[model samples]
Target: ASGRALFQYPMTSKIELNGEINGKKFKVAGEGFTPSSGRFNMHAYCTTGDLPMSWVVIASPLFHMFAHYPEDITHFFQECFPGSYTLDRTLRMEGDGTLTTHHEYSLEDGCVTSKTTLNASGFDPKGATMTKSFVKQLPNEVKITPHGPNGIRLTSTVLYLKEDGTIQIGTQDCIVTPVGGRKVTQPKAHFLHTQIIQKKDPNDTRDHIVQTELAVAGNLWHGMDELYK
Candidate 1:
């Protein structure tokens, strides 16, 4: 099957982590989903920094498979991550509403591969969704690399699609790689890597926002790199 189809029915699972952010200990929880219109949402409440920001990353059959109502996917993210932020610029859509740019990076030997989807409605920080979403077996390795200066790396390769169509794998390793030992200082400006799993809660808004307090000490860049390789 194509990597795209694999993502549509990704093996499901969950990963839990506990770590410290600025001397405060916290717990981080994540749930992965497969190809569904429902979407994945992640919210992290800082113990001492800003309030919190929610990320709603979703793949729509309407856009991916049917290729209809492409704007719906874009609106979803706008509703999830609104306002002015550095990452927001990278998520802008063209005037015609079509994707402006799409790129992927992979190791020639097939040890690692990564793809990035950028537009008004979709994004792949580490290119994991676009790379492994459609593959039957987890790649031998995976890794996630940061952009510049203060960046983190996450590495791993254990892909499993769940019964509910969620993807649950593990990050083999994570590390902070930066130039000149320059570390990220701003709290809200830091990256919050997470996964959202779907739940059928009547009380919960059909497209409600959920928040949690958790922390995980690891690099996403490394995890994504291992997957791509």
Candidate 2:
């Protein structure tokens, strides 16, 4: 077993996001992937009318010599790709000498709810506390079926509620198609239609609906290759 593979999901994707939050046009272009169970990374830059900003999201959990899955040893989430089931968990995470946060999630009976509480003790002397809630329920007949000739479509809608009385409803319709002349088992092209509706927010005078599209083209592999001497 010296020359075996080392990863469960190794993927590299180029992402192009064209979406607007609340009537403001914004675009994002970047690359991201997860090579191992303990490694997750993404780097994307955003463009808007006001100023340009970049986003960096990464998680490097290399505690067990990268030999074990995260969920087997810790409370780390195991659900990310697509299929879902019942889940109820509460986790507290300590940041890198900056903040502390608590996440509570409950998903059952086609309804899913999650709440996050953030405590900013190191950033501000006043100790700011922020809480946000998001809930989504699937329809009675929800299905992920074939879209075009060789694509699969998945649709989801979620409602977000902030502690400051802001509410937003977001919906996404995504289609995944395999590329490189491969079968449907490996998807390399993705197209998504997104819609966001801001409702019942004190910061705005009226509700607004924003629509956008996203496309991605790249390769995705379930396992990594090994080099043997």
Candidate 3:
């Protein structure tokens, strides 16, 4: 019912990310999927030890920006990609060996909400404490543009409203390029990505910036895989 879009559905990829938050370096390695339904999902774990709990909170939404962008194949802008739709599910994040983020995404009547809880029962670091929960809803605006001959750029700006009359803004910008100069229409095309994210807290005077580089491999798309032969 729609025109050409970005990415083929029901695919899996191995992800490796190198990032820096608050001057401390961390590494995340996990898997990401563009399911047959819904937008997409990623479960990335921070391998760094003894970091702030806020790192999980901030990283939770920021990593969502490093998604699949198959611009080398199609050229339309719409919310029909594999993971662009709403779904009810939970995605997990292991943060810096001390904390874990359990994020729940639910949609109702065309409204989507992200509920996140940081749990610290495994072990305690310097600033580890009890559990904390945060919630935010959609109005996440995503824009994609052609970067060059073989790359695409994506940016997302999200406004989150809370109960205390406070608001937080999250911004993400990333560029994705296919590896080996392979056409994105091919099912095996890997990706190289770089992203920068800004997390603005309503109560804090200064914002946090996270710089990340991602390498995505093993891109196997449903039904399209055999076509690559």
Candidate 4:
């Protein structure tokens, strides 16, 4: 019998801050998952020592499954986030467009091998029409190594596919080690990793509360803050 391809998995991560800004303590908590059905769910929170902010963002990519086809993945995103115009194989979102970018990917061996930046321009809630440029062939690689009982080590470079077909590669390394004997049963070889960026402010204290509420209300996880080291 063919194995069931659609599955749901739970993953979580936390960020601990060790500095103070303007004599205020800041912290951030985030968690998300990649379901076997090919969708992504993620949320991030920012906060000061005791107070949380109200601004939070949730991003998810609805995916279409292909036994092994990259174009299917690209098409899923395009159809899910359609635009008003298409130029040079790029789509532009219409009406107060929250997403203003176009992207195309190159597939190799059933995975996204590379991506070409197409276009990016949109108005953010900050009342600013931001312009994002792209650079291609940016290094985006992942490596996994086992450390016996010490847990597994997974490393990867920072990479992002913007709304436009642009790629932004950051010179940062992400390393993750899963413990608690949970690594063995994890559906994926590497379940999580850390980002190299550091938060250094407290103006967004309510951000954490907002994110926590969203995660819990959305049923993403229970008690999301305790998932990290």
Candidate 5:
């Protein structure tokens, strides 16, 4: 979605990301069970050529303006650069909708940490083995609208990486509304198994990630059949 999304914020079910590089395996995960999906996902099991990591689908108020302003995520990556900046999905939601947001900052070893929980469930740039579906083939209740105030549609953002001893980048997200008045067309999806365990020499004092492991999550629907296929 050219709408530009990078983070929305809020999570309760799960938001985990593992560690390891030069050693092996890096993880990124996000979950929003009631709204469906918007993007947010990956595994820094990196490569580049064969392509092991890299996905940045946008939408959701430029994904929470780079997820709660860190100088707009360093001015949107010194001017656009989530490993090549691509956009889509605009952070979709329906199926029993109910959204909310407000919370950011994650990057332990790399510094930057604050904003502690309010109503944010963010991160989703889903790079599940790359190729297509960076999110935005359209269809998820037409992809987002009113995000703050009340009766929210969908607020987004996500990012996670483990090894607090060294590696860290947890920027989780979420919030979809309409449980009383009802506006969630069909909503019904579930996910929560975020595991992290790829240790070795995890790396601390700084300079270990080499700029490979990043994280975020999004893209959500709810009961469209085929088990949310």
Candidate 6:
């Protein structure tokens, strides 16, 4: 019988990021199939020679970012290279338009500061050593009870607020393993799904809004191994 190839994820998410900060403006854009490897290396590692502990630190936040404030991802990189760090971006959007969820990292007050904004609508990024952040979830916002008690826990929300008054609107979710449904561990699961709407620079003559997403996924182990194609 004839057959057709299949695409990945339940479906997939298309993400776009673009904005201006300080006198310097920049952009980062991506579409479908985002991997969970942190900002500097925003793809989950499974190759040979990677250390377990190092993987843990990066992988954990990689999983966490998609669950909440994704824009902060740029900050993670800013902290790594106090200076000399450029935008580690995908360089393309699956579609066309201005990008949101933009960032700027620089030396400020003699310290590396990085800030991200839901832009186009208007949020300017200023560099910071690290920005204050928190996550708020409306338990009721979860509409995917389909994943309940099936060894898979996933939920979607339309709003997640940052203490900095950054209104991050999107559906961020994950597949995680639960111990008594209290703590989440990766070996138990992996993946971060995103579908967020970005703001537009209302003052700009160009009416622009961005739909950003990065559905990152993978499995984490306490140890490394060898697997071949």
Give the best candidate by lDDT. 3
Better of 2 and 5 by lDDT: 2
TM-score of each: 0.23, 0.31, 0.39, 0.28, 0.19, 0.22
Using TM-score as the measure, which candidate wins?
A: 3
**Clash pairs, model 2 backbone:** none
lDDT of 3 by residue, 43-116 (tens): 44455543333432444343232244454433222232222321111222223233333333332232223344
Off by over 4 Å in 6: 1-4, 8-151, 155-159, 162-188, 193-197, 201-209, 221-229
Models sorted by TM-score, best on top: 3, 2, 4, 1, 6, 5
lDDT of 5: 0.25
Q: Identify the superior model by lDDT, candidate 5 or candidate 6.
A: 6
Output the lDDT of residue 208, model 3.
30
lDDT by residue for model 4 over 1-229, one digit each (tens)? 1112222133222322222222334454444333323333334454344421112111111011111122211121122111111111222222222221122322222232111122223433332122322222222233333334433333444454444665443232222222222323212132222221122236644443211111101112334324433
Per-residue lDDT of model 2, residues 141-215, tens digit only: 112334455445544443334345554433433333433223333222221222221222245232211111121
Worst 10 residues of 6 by lDDT: 1-10
lDDT of 6 at 210: 27
Q: Determine which window of 10 residues in candidate 5 has minimal summed lDDT.
A: 206-215
What stretches of model 5 exceed 4 Å from their correct place?
1-54, 58-111, 114-129, 132-173, 176-229
Error in Å for residue 94 of model 4:
37
Q: Report residue 14 deviation for candidate 6 (angstroms).
A: 12
lDDT of 6 by residue, 188-227 (tens): 2222343332333456333222223334333332122122
